[PDB]
Every structure is written in structure tokens, then in C-alpha cells.
Amino acid sequence: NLNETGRVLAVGDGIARVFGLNNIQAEELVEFSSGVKGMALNLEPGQVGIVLFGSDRLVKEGELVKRTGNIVDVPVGPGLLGRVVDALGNPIDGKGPIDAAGRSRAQVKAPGILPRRSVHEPVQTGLKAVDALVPIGRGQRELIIGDRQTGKTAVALDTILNQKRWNNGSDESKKLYCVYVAVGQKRSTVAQLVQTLEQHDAMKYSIIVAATASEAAPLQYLAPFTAASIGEWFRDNGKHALIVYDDLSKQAVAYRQLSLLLRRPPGREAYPGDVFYLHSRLLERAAKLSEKEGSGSLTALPVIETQGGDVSAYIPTNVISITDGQIFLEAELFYKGIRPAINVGLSVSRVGSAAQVKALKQVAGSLKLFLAQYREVAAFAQFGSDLDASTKQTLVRGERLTQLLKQNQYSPLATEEQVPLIYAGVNGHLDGIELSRIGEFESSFLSYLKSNHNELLTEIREKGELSKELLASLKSATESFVAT
Amino acid sequence: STPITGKVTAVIGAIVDVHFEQSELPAILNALEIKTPQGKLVLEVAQHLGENTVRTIAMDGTEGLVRGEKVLDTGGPISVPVGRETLGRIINVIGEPIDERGPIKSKLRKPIHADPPSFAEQSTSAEILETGIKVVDLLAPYARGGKIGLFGGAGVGKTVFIQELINNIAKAHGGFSVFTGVGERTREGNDLYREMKETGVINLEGESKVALVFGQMNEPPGARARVALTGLTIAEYFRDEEGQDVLLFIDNIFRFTQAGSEVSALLGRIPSAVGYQPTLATDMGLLQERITTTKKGSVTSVQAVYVPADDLTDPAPATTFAHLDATTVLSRGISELGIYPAVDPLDSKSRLLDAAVVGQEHYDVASKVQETLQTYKSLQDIIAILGMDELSEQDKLTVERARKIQRFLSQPFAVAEVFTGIPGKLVRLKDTVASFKAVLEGKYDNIPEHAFYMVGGIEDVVAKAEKLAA
Amino acid sequence: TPITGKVTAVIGAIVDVHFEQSELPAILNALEIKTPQGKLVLEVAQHLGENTVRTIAMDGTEGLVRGEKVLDTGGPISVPVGRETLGRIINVIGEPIDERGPIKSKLRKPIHADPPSFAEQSTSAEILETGIKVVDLLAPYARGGKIGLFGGAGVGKTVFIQELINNIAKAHGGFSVFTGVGERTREGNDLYREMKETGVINLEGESKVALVFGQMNEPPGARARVALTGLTIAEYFRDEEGQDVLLFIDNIFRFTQAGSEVSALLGRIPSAVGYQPTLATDMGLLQERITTTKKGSVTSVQAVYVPADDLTDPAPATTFAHLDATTVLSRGISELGIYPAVDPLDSKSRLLDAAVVGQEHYDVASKVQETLQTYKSLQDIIAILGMDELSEQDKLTVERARKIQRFLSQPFAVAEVFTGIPGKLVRLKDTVASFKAVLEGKYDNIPEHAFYMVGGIEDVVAKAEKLAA
Amino acid sequence: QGYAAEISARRNAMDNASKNAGDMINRYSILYNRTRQAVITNELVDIITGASS
Ligand SMILES: Nc1ncnc2c1ncn2[C@@H]1O[C@H](COP(=O)(O)OP(=O)(O)NP(=O)(O)O)[C@@H](O)[C@H]1O
Ligand SMILES: Nc1ncnc2c1ncn2[C@@H]1O[C@H](COP(=O)(O)OP(=O)(O)NP(=O)(O)O)[C@@H](O)[C@H]1O
Ligand SMILES: Nc1ncnc2c1ncn2[C@@H]1O[C@H](COP(=O)(O)OP(=O)(O)NP(=O)(O)O)[C@@H](O)[C@H]1O
Numbered sequence A: 001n002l003n004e005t006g007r008v009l010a011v012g013d014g015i016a017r018v019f020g021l022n023n024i025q026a027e028e029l030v031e032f033s034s035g036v037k038g039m040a041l042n043l044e045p046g047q048v049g050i051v052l053f054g055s056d057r058l059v060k061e062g063e064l065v066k067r068t069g070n071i072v073d074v075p076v077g078p079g080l081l082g083r084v085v086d087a088l089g090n091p092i093d094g095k096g097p098i099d100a101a102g103r104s105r106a107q108v109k110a111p112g113i114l115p116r117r118s119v120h121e122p123v124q125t126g127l128k129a130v131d132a133l134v135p136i137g138r139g140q141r142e143l144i145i146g147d148r149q150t151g152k153t154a155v156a157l158d159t160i161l162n163q164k165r166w167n168n169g170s171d172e173s174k175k176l177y178c179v180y181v182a183v184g185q186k187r188s189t190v191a192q193l194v195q196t197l198e199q200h201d202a203m204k205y206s207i208i209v210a211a212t213a214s215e216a217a218p219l220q221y222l223a224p225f226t227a228a229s230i231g232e233w234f235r236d237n238g239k240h241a242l243i244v245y246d247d248l249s250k251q252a253v254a255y256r257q258l259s260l261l262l263r264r265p266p267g268r269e270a271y272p273g274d275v276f277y278l279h280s281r282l283l284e285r286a287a288k289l290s291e292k293e294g295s296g297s298l299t300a301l302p303v304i305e306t307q308g309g310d311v312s313a314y315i316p317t318n319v320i321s322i323t324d325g326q327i328f329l330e331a332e333l334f335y336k337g338i339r340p341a342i343n344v345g346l347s348v349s350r351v352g353s354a355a356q357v358k359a360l361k362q363v364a365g366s367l368k369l370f371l372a373q374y375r376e377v378a379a380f381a382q383f384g385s386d387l388d389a390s391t392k393q394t395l396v397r398g399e400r401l402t403q404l405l406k407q408n409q410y411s412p413l414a415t416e417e418q419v420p421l422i423y424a425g426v427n428g429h430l431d432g433i434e435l436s437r438i439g440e441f442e443s444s445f446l447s448y449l450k451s452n453h454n455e456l457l458t459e460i461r462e463k464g465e466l467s468k469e470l471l472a473s474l475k476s477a478t479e480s481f482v483a484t
Numbered sequence B: 001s002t003p004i005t006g007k008v009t010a011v012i013g014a015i016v017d018v019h020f021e022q023s024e025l026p027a028i029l030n031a032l033e034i035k036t037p038q039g040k041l042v043l044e045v046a047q048h049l050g051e052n053t054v055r056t057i058a059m060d061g062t063e064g065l066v067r068g069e070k071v072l073d074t075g076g077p078i079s080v081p082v083g084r085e086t087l088g089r090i091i092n093v094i095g096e097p098i099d100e101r102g103p104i105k106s107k108l109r110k111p112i113h114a115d116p117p118s119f120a121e122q123s124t125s126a127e128i129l130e131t132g133i134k135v136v137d138l139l140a141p142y143a144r145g146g147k148i149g150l151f152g153g154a155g156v157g158k159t160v161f162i163q164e165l166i167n168n169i170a171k172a173h174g175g176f177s178v179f180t181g182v183g184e185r186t187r188e189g190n191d192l193y194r195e196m197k198e199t200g201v202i203n204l205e206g207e208s209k210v211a212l213v214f215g216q217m218n219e220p221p222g223a224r225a226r227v228a229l230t231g232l233t234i235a236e237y238f239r240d241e242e243g244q245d246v247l248l249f250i251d252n253i254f255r256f257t258q259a260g261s262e263v264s265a266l267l268g269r270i271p272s273a274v275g276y277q278p279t280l281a282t283d284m285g286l287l288q289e290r291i292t293t294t295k296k297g298s299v300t301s302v303q304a305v306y307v308p309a310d311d312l313t314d315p316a317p318a319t320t321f322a323h324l325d326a327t328t329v330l331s332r333g334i335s336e337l338g339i340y341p342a343v344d345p346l347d348s349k350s351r352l353l354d355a356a357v358v359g360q361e362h363y364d365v366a367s368k369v370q371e372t373l374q375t376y377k378s379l380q381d382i383i384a385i386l387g388m389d390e391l392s393e394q395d396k397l398t399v400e401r402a403r404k405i406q407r408f409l410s411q412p413f414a415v416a417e418v419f420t421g422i423p424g425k426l427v428r429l430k431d432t433v434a435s436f437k438a439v440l441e442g443k444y445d446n447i448p449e450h451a452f453y454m455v456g457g458i459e460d461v462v463a464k465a466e467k468l469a470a
Numbered sequence C: 001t002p003i004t005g006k007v008t009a010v011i012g013a014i015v016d017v018h019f020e021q022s023e024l025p026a027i028l029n030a031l032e033i034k035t036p037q038g039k040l041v042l043e044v045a046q047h048l049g050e051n052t053v054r055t056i057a058m059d060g061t062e063g064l065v066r067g068e069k070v071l072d073t074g075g076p077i078s079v080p081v082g083r084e085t086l087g088r089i090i091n092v093i094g095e096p097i098d099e100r101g102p103i104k105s106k107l108r109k110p111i112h113a114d115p116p117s118f119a120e121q122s123t124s125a126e127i128l129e130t131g132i133k134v135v136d137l138l139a140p141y142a143r144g145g146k147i148g149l150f151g152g153a154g155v156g157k158t159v160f161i162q163e164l165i166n167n168i169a170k171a172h173g174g175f176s177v178f179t180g181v182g183e184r185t186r187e188g189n190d191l192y193r194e195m196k197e198t199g200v201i202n203l204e205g206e207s208k209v210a211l212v213f214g215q216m217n218e219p220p221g222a223r224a225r226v227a228l229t230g231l232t233i234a235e236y237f238r239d240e241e242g243q244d245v246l247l248f249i250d251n252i253f254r255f256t257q258a259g260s261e262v263s264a265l266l267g268r269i270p271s272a273v274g275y276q277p278t279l280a281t282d283m284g285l286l287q288e289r290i291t292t293t294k295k296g297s298v299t300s301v302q303a304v305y306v307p308a309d310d311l312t313d314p315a316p317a318t319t320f321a322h323l324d325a326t327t328v329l330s331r332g333i334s335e336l337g338i339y340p341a342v343d344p345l346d347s348k349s350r351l352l353d354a355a356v357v358g359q360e361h362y363d364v365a366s367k368v369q370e371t372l373q374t375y376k377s378l379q380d381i382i383a384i385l386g387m388d389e390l391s392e393q394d395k396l397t398v399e400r401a402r403k404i405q406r407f408l409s410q411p412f413a414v415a416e417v418f419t420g421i422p423g424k425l426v427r428l429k430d431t432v433a434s435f436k437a438v439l440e441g442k443y444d445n446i447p448e449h450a451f452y453m454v455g456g457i458e459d460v461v462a463k464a465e466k467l468a469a
Numbered sequence D: 001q002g003y004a005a006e007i008s009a010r011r012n013a014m015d016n017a018s019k020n021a022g023d024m025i026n027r028y029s030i031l032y033n034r035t036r037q038a039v040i041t042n043e044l045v046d047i048i049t050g051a052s053s
């Protein structure tokens, strides 16, 4: 019966051409008699082009191939928390069966125009530079982009670690469940990353979806999509999930391999014609739902790897045009001491202050514009010319503000800790302190604030805003510390 | 019904091949339909392959399609409802309401493919559209019933610009508007729709003055390739049969060319330069030449035009310029300095900047503003290496006036208030001319730079100057 | 009774073979054709349909005639494993090439095998001291980790690998495997002799190292597989003997390049730059086997050739993420006389963490990098306008950076002939204190030349004294 | 005396600046012509791969 089964005509490179399967659906999952699974991508007049989810060493000509009558899906639900799975939802951590709430297709239409509401809730990364200058909101997509080894994973990792603050509480609406997608990475690197998540007690609210270097192209292609359906469960059920795609550069390379092996005619740099679509339907699924749909949200931090700083290249241009903003990392700034190595001039969050704690906003008034004024002023002074009060003051302030934003890894700060630092910077309380001492000032100011002005901190954390009275209290609390 | 049937024979991504019986093939550009468990899938016929098989482009995802499935010919091209019943409604590429508000009970439907107006049907006109934006009104004024393009790289300000124009031009205008979202962010759509309601441009329980059409970047290439024509057909009906002034906003038109590009290889075509389709220019022609004023009615169109990697020489935007009566070119370099709107004052152009149209006085200020600006661009290499000290007496004065002019060209938009915290300002064309004239004559040389930044007319400059000194 | 076929087609390294009845050899199986020389080995790559298979040859295909008889061996290419391989030179196909007779090992293992799962991974942050200043200070290697040496033609990949062998292999305790991939036969001959002299190979005794060679004179099939061969030997030591193995590969870029020589003949549409579409996953199937697991540990040092000095090339570019530490050698730096030509700002390691090396070491490494970056950011101004146009801070920072840069050079024992000076091995702790002091401006009065091509700070002081005469 | 000394020092600095810069120009012209060449080739290659199918 050629309708529900077929035979292999030819097989090689993770592709199989199958005669028969007359009733198969485009993108349907199939089972090979030899063991390995596969996906139907090319439905042609004489045959079916199938991309395998594993090795092909065991498939041969003549082999029987069997329908499943299912479009490629995956298990979803809270059951997945604390688990490490492959692209198809199979547990790869050796901790037994996943309990699923249901199954969701890998490819799911994004929320249309109607079922959405403006992004208005902070995703607190705990990174001074991000949270003050490029605030990320619940439902937003914010690209992390940079050359190799520039701190890109470090920015998502610290974000996940910092959700510890709400995920231990019992308030479901303030919780953020994290999903981390590793595409093209090596297993030891993912192993190392789950170990860090455990040591920080962050694994209990994270889901890792892994399609690593050794796995078949079609698994790497699929992983972001199935991870999104995992994230989508939280979104559809009135909760919030944050998904990290590490990285989309590698997924695009994997899509490029499938398509060339299916002999679909290549486009620019040999990628498929619709490489832009691959990412755009991926990322539009990240969204902030309306009240009628239960206000759940999904937030995406896609990662893209440039080459030689070239943010003008094919895939980076594509993704930059999809997301709501980018964080831009650079080797030069890293070695200069600026860590995270965020390029402020180029780095934007488009939700901006709509999705930022008010207290943080209040204190970081024009910090971005000012740091821009500082960049200009510093560029000029490099002419070795003498300077006036105005130029020397801002050159002083900006130099300290830059220093203020440097931050160790795995060390995310609370909002109530960030506010007073930015405040002391922006209004100029740091201006008469030696530059090498800004690091020690940070911890000592906080230790002082935790001992004496602890009531101040609580107001900031619980209200999230600064009344005229709080500002006055904070003004005096800083001035007091500036002289021992 | 007298219905015609075929069978799916191939599915590769967006491309679907369909076999029909003898001498009853549907014509190229016909819509075909497949019944799906959810609703229906639309295909648009693209090629006749021979041997009674046609190649089609899907208007939705093809996942779940089976070889041998029945395909229905609809007899003509994708249709969309036209007329007043589209007002205050959101419509997708295939003419179907996507606002959950019921059917669009309009008297007529019309094909999204139509021939452009003949050469005899053209109507030339030199009437100025006052925007209230200083840089546009002074240096590259827009034309009533003309074609305006907003060129810009990722994140430079196209969408905010287009929103400002909607906010100023649309209320002052008395006819109807049509907004088309092509290949952009669905959440931009959700924002615009929420805005229109609060402004009253869309009243759910009454009359409305704008038609929304969306085909955003979540949608497959075929949808994104056709949705501009859907929005257009609605604007054409208002131009021709309603007989009145129509505004047509499109964000973003690049997405039409890009979508076209994404399927071109699977359609069977050798690529052209920079991986674009070989039909890039004729496809753009067929579409753009419909977006036009005729002797029957007026269409004023504003089209945002994305510019890949910031490269203005890239085939897509490069081909777009010549279709356009006035081009506003946005610039990363200008935005990075904190000047919004980031309009490049040298690269932006308008057919209307002619003494015969704006007057001699207006034209002279414009020229001299541009000369001052270019001199400054020219001298920037003497500044960077040898510094301001080395300049001539008359050169120092030109640089100081230029720096003021650069800043004076910036303006707080009403729609940009969340980004700035500055209340929006709208400035009359005549104040813009008078203001810049005074500056070029040296009437405000003693006033420092920051006083010209992010304000309105000249009275605002004077007011900021006194506030900074105190 | 054995399964036979006939050759239907030969194009270069690719041979197509037809099989008469129902049973076809699995993908990855070795096939054989009897030549008057000896035997030619083929490896099944795909099933073409109509009972034909497509194979990749493991030697020259000169002489093959359509119609020739082909034997299925029943499984993949196999190699000798265990202790019997130590002190021996071996083929891509597992044969002895040192004219010392048969390698009589108990077991033979297939060269193709699944990488260790995610559950089998074992991670640790442990410094492997090399005695090389730039590495130890700025980008330390990890015991049981992966280490790539990236470099264009003739910048010093091999000499760097040789120095590592000389420093770490001599007293290591476990076993080493050396794999020559697509490199110079003469370097293989050099190495063999070198090991015999340093007593790491003993013809009469015991040996710590097993040699596997597929050099640049070999057809692309051999160059594409020989690394798997070296790897399988290494995996046996890791899993079965639970040992700390050292795996040296020179040069792994050549595995990929061999892969691309045959991609078109296999009927693929070329990817970017004419590489095989399978560049990334082919690389993972290999790279992911070279790892430490819970059973045992593998420290690997891979030379990575950079074609046309282009680090963005798909081969090197994809290799980066497979490596725990990367030292990138630079032609710019080597043309200035600085060896090893390491790029102190582009070389990286996962272990440069205060939690691993201590705050002091991290702080010093950071500040070295700051100093050098400040100098780098000023190249243009310097080249046009020169030192006179710098500010006073900058002039100091640059003067210090020029020393740190020279201080990062080191005489290597293996490079003695080119430097003219005896080689120096400097200890990690010495390196940290030396650089610490320079950063503190304690040697600002010392001429640059004294920092060039010496050991630690003492050598500097001693050289400064000699020149004062 | 300081003026005359300065102007002679600026003349000779500007002399070496011009000379060093004119050296860079040469090196960058050559890099330019390599890259211009490589862009034509790489662009042709895509066009050709797309025309093989
Ligand atoms: N704020 C920080 N301060 C100091 N070091 C940091 C910081 N963030 C990251 N690093 C280190 O910098 C290196 C690169 O960080 P990582 O997040 O791996 O970047 P990446 O861009 O993902 N690199 P890769 O995927 O390897 O190309 C690692 O050694 C980090 O531990
Ligand atoms: N008038 C303005 N005033 C201040 N900031 C602005 C203005 N216009 C744009 N921006 C900044 O630019 C960002 C993007 O504006 P937007 O109009 O979306 O750019 P765009 O060119 O349409 N980007 P894209 O659609 O992604 O190509 C905003 O989030 C602001 O930060
Ligand atoms: N540590 C060193 N000290 C001094 N000279 C060196 C050093 N390393 C390499 N060289 C010089 O560089 C030449 C080549 O070094 P080698 O290790 O062969 O580099 P390579 O990058 O492996 N060459 P190839 O493999 O052909 O690209 C030698 O002839 C030496 O002159």
C-alpha cells in the first residue's frame, strides 16, 4: 500500500528520496524501519524528499518508510522545567520521561494584530548597562550581537540568573520562566552551562533545548522552533517566558545545509531564498498578549555572531531588521575594560522606558545622551588642546559614568541597588573621586546603604518609583557618604 | 457554481504545483483555493509549466498539504472589498477581515491586479503639501497628490516619521486614508490600531476615515508579495469611483521586492545582481505606476523605504528613487549625533524646490542653507586634523552658522514624545523660511548652539537662549 | 559467502559500484578491490538507487577499469587499538608504515563512532601550565580541554606544537597520540626521529606515543579519514584504559579541505566559498569525539591552518566554537620578529577567570590587555604623525606597551636554530610577578631591547646590564 | 627665535606626515584593488551556483 508507506530510492548526506507515501502531508513526521526519524520537505511528482533527524548510516535503498500522520510537534508544559531535551523534546539529561501537558507543533502562527498589548513590564537583567540604557520589556525581542568571544552568552546568562529574585516568590505574575536554546554548540559547552545554572539554583526554572554540533542539520534547524512552542505554553497560559536563541547564525547555516542537500536552488551566499523568513516567523512568535488572551508574554534574546565586526553582513542585517533593538558587543571595548562590552552609541531598546522601573528611569534621565556628549567631547580632546570648565566637567563625569557601568560576570544587581549608583553618577556626586576608586565605591556605598539607609532601599524595591521626598532623602544619603 | 478542479502535484515550501484537466487551465494571476481543517488556503497562479500543470505561490503556510488534494479555481484574481465599507476595518492580503468585527458587507469586490493609468491619463501639478516639519518644508517640500518616499537604514526613524505625517496631514485632510503594513512588525500594527481609536480616526460605533491593511513579517513571502496590491486597490477605488483626495501610507515598500526575492529561485529563475529577482524593476513598475494621481482623482502617497545595510546603492532602494516626487533620506550619521528627525539635508530632494513653485525668497534660503551646510561638510577634514584655529575669518563664521543650522533643522515630533520627554512642535512653512533667513543674515550669531537644538521656530530659539542663561 | 560488485564509474577519488542482488553494503562500510600493488580500500558514502553505491577511495584510483570486482568487508574501516600501537607509525586504513611488521593488537575498532552523549560530559576548570609566557598569562590551556593554534602559512603553528610536546609530553604520565593530517611527510620523518632520541619511542622498550599519518601527498579520501583513525586510538585509551590521553593534530584544517575536494564529485551544490554544504556537521562529528568524559580525559592540541590569512573563512571560523582555548598566531606580529607570534588580544581561553587563576593573575592579565589595546587603538595616529603628537598619558602607556609586547616574546627550545639563543621555559607564577612589576612602572628606565627574546624579569635585568657595556 | 624654530618643526612634521600618509595610500590602494576583484568573483560565483540548478 503506497499511500501510508513508501520505499527508499536513494539515500545519502542525511537526505532520503522516497517513492510512494501518496497521502503524506508537507512537513509530516515519518518513521524509517531501520530506526531513525525524518521530516517530509519536498513533495514532488515521483518521490518525496525527506530530511533525517539522525544518522543515515543505517538506511538503505528499498527500506520501508512509514507515515505518522503528524506535522512535526513536541511535548509542552511545566513538566519540562529543570530538564534538558533535544530538538524533538526527548530528554537527554538521563532523568527519565518528561511529563507533558500536551503537544504543540514546531511551526506555529504568531499572534496577529488583535490579541496583543503594548510591552510595559521590565525584564530585569540586573546588568547596570542594559537596565539603564537599553531596557528590555516582557514580550520584546532584543538581539545580542557581536564577534566571537565578546560576551554574548554572558548577557543572557546573567539575565536568567537574575530571575532568582522573583522565581522563589509565590507571585506567578512577576515570575519569568527561562528557555535556553543551544544550536550548533558543543556538548561540553552546554554541559558547562547547565552546571553553572545548577550552582546558582537557576535550573529549576529553566528549560534547555539542545541541538549541538554533532546532531543532524535538520535538528539544528528545528530546535529554535520547538523551543518556541515550549516557551509558548507559558505565554498562552498567563505566565511569562524568556527564550534565548544561541545562536541564529548557526541555525541559518543548518537550514542552508538541509536546502542544498534537498537540491533547492540557493540564494545569496548560498543560503535559501527565504532565510529571512526563517527568522522572522521565529521571532514574531515572541509577543505580549492582550488581557482577553490572559496577558502572558514571551521575550526573545536571539544571538547573532558577526565576523570581523561586520554588522552589515547578510544574516545580521536580516535579524537586526526583525528585532525591537540590539545590544552590540565589541572586542575593543572588552579589552579596554568595558564589560559587558556594550557599544552604547549603536545599542538601542525600542520599547525603551515604557518597560523600565520608574526609579531607574528617574535617575537615568539623559544618561544615554550625556554619554554621547562624553563620546563627542573625548573624541575632540584627542587633539591635545587645553580645555574649559564645560569640556573638562563632562569629560570628568562621562569618564566616571563609563566606569560605574563596568560589572563582573554572574553578579547581577537588584533595581534598588542600581538606582543609587546611577543617581550618584548622573547628578555628579562621583565627579570628585579618583577614577581607580569607583569600583570600591560601588560596594562600600551599597554596604553603607544596607546598614544605615535600608528603609530607603525597601521603598525603592516595593514602590518602584521615587516621590519628591525619596529623592531628597537619597540626595542627603549620598552626600553623607562622599566624605567617608 | 460551475466549478473547476485540479490536484496538487508538488510542494516545495511556498511553491505549489497543480495539475488540471485538458484546456481548462486557470489564467496566470488567478486565485485558487484549498479547503484546510482550519479554514482555506489561497494559491495564486504564477506559471504555466506545460503538460497541464501550473505553478502557484501560496498565500499562507503549506505545512499540512497533501499531493492529490482538490484545488478549486475561483475564476479570477484575488479579490478585495472596496468602498466605504472598508473604512475603520483591518483587512489581510486576501480581502478577509482580520479584526473579528464580522463580514465586510461591501457592494463590490475588485481584483488586486490592475493595469496602471495610461500616459494620456496622467495629470501634472505643482501644489505644495505643508507638513509642519522644518526640514521638509524648507529644503524638499512634499507635493499634494504626489509621491513621497522615506529612505532609511534599520532603526533610523522611518516608522516614527510616517506616524508624524499621519498625525499632521491626515486630520487636516478631508478625504479618506488607506494604511498598508507590508512585511513589518505585527506589534507596530497593534499600536497603530490602538492609536487610530484614541485619536478618533477610527470610531468603531460610527464613521471612520482610514482603512487598515496588514501583511506583516510573520507571513510567508507570497502574502508579503501581494499585500501592497491589496492596499492599493482600495485606494484606487477611492481615487476613481469615489472621486476625491486619497492618502495612501505604505510601510514598508521594500518588503514587496524582498518577498518577491524570497520565492524567485524556487519559481525557476536565475538570480540577478545582489541575489535579487531578474524582474525587480518591472515588478516595481507595475506596482508603483498604479500609485498615482490621474485626471479622475488625487492620491498622495507616503512610502517608507528600507535600505539594506544602510547601502543606498542596493538595487532595491536605488530602483525606487525615480518613482518618487520627493525623497526624504534618513541617515545613521545624523541620528547618531542626536538630531531627529535624522533627515540628511543634502541628500533629500523634491521636484517642487523650484522658484516657480515656492517663490524666489524660499528658493534662495534653501540654496544658501544647503551651501552653508556643504561648506561645513567640506571643511570637516581641516577641522579633524588641524582644528578650528586654522580656518579663515569668513570660514569660521560659516562653520558657526552651519552648526546652528544643523541643530535648528531638528524638531520634536508629537509622536516621538515618549522617546524625548519634549512636547511636540509643528512649525508653519512661512515661519520656517523667515526663521532660517534671519539666521543666514547673521541676526542670531551671539546665540549659542544648544538654543537651536530640538525646538520650534525662531521665537522658541530666543526663548531657550534666555532660559539657559538664567 | 562474500558480497561482490562491479565498478561502474570512476571520477577521481569517487568510485561508483553496482551490486547484482538485493543486498547492498551499508553507508560507511569499507570495500576492497584487488590491485597488483596490493589492495585499494573504498568507503561507501551514499546509495544512488538502482543497486549502485557511491564510494570514496582511500588511495589513488589510477588504473581502475569499469567492470572490476569489488569486495564488501562487512563493516567500516578498522584500526588496531590498545597498547600494541604505541611506538608505531600507522595508516589511515590502520596498516603499519614503519616496516616493523604486523601490529598484533587484541582488538580492531571501526574509525566511525558516535560522540559521547550529553549525559557523558564531564567539565572542569584546571590550568595546564605550558611554560610559555603569553599562553600562561593571557589565555591558559585546560587539562582535558581543546586547544587550537590558528595561523596562516609559515607563522609558526608546527614549531608551537613541537614546543608543547617538548614541554608537556615528556613528563605527562599517560599516553599520547600524534596525527599528521595533510602536512609534510618530512615533518613526520623529523618527528619520528625526534621521539626516538628523547626516548618517548623505544624500539626495544616501552613507548608513550602512537603515530598516525595521512600527509599532504595523499589523495583526498585518505586526508579526510586519517584524523578519525588517530582519534579512535585515542578513544580506546580514554574509555577502556581510563587514561589521560594527549591528542596532537597537525593540521586539522586539512580534514575539511579534503572534504571539499570530493564534495562536487559526490554531486553536492557548493556552499559559500565552494566548501561542502556539510562543513559544520562534518566538523562536529569529528570534533565532538575529541573530548573528556566521565571515563577518562583527553587534552588535545590542534593546529588550524588559516587559508589566505583569512580568519573569516568557513573552515577556521567554524572551528572556533569547538575549542576551550585559542591561540591565534599573526603574520603581522611574526614579521616584526616577535615569536611566538601570538596575538595577545585575539587569543582566548575559558579559564581566564578569577575563580580559576586568582584575582592577582586575572587583574594583571586584564591590565596587560588594557595597555596593549591602548597602543592598538593608536596605530594610525602613530604611523602618520608619530610619537610627538601623543598626550603624556598616551606616550607613557605606549612606551610600556612596546615593552610588554617584547616581553611576550620567548626563545623556544625547538626554534634554537632560528633565534640563535638557548630556549627558555618560564613558570606561570614567575610570569605573573614579572608582568605585575612591569605594569607598576618598576622597569620604565630599561631599554625595550632588554625585554626581547628572554625568560622572566631576571633575564630582562641581566640583559639590560650587558647592553650598558 | 621660538617662532622660527616652531615653524621649521611644523614644516618637518607635516613633511613626515605627508610622506607616511602617502605610504599608507599605496598599501591601501593595493588592498582596494584586491578587494574590488574579489567582490566581482564572489558575486559571480553566487550568480553561477544559482544558474546550475
Ligand atoms: N562582564 C564580564 N566581565 C568579565 N568577563 C566577562 C564578562 N562577561 C563575559 N566575560 C568573559 O568573556 C568571555 C566571553 O564571554 P561569552 O559569553 O562566552 O561570549 P560569546 O560572545 O558567547 N563567545 P562564543 O560563543 O564563545 O563566541 C568569557 O571568558 C566570559 O567569562
Ligand atoms: N523623532 C524621533 N525622536 C527621537 N528618537 C527617534 C525618532 N525617530 C526614531 N527615533 C529612534 O529610533 C528608534 C526607531 O524608530 P523607527 O521609526 O522605528 O525606526 P525605523 O527606521 O522605522 N526602524 P526599522 O523599521 O526597524 O527599519 C526609536 O525607538 C527611537 O529610539
Ligand atoms: N618560535 C619560533 N621562533 C623563531 N622562529 C620561528 C618560531 N616559530 C616559527 N618560526 C619561523 O617560522 C618558520 C616556520 O615555522 P612553522 O612552525 O613551520 O610555521 P607553520 O605556520 O607551521 N608553517 P606551515 O605549516 O607551512 O603554514 C620557521 O622556519 C622559523 O623561521
Ligand SMILES: [Mg+2]
Pocket: A152, A153, A154, A246
Ligand atoms: Mg556564546
Ligand SMILES: [Mg+2]
Pocket: B158, B159, B160, B184
Ligand atoms: Mg519601522
Ligand SMILES: [Mg+2]
Pocket: C157, C158, C159, C183
Ligand atoms: Mg606546519
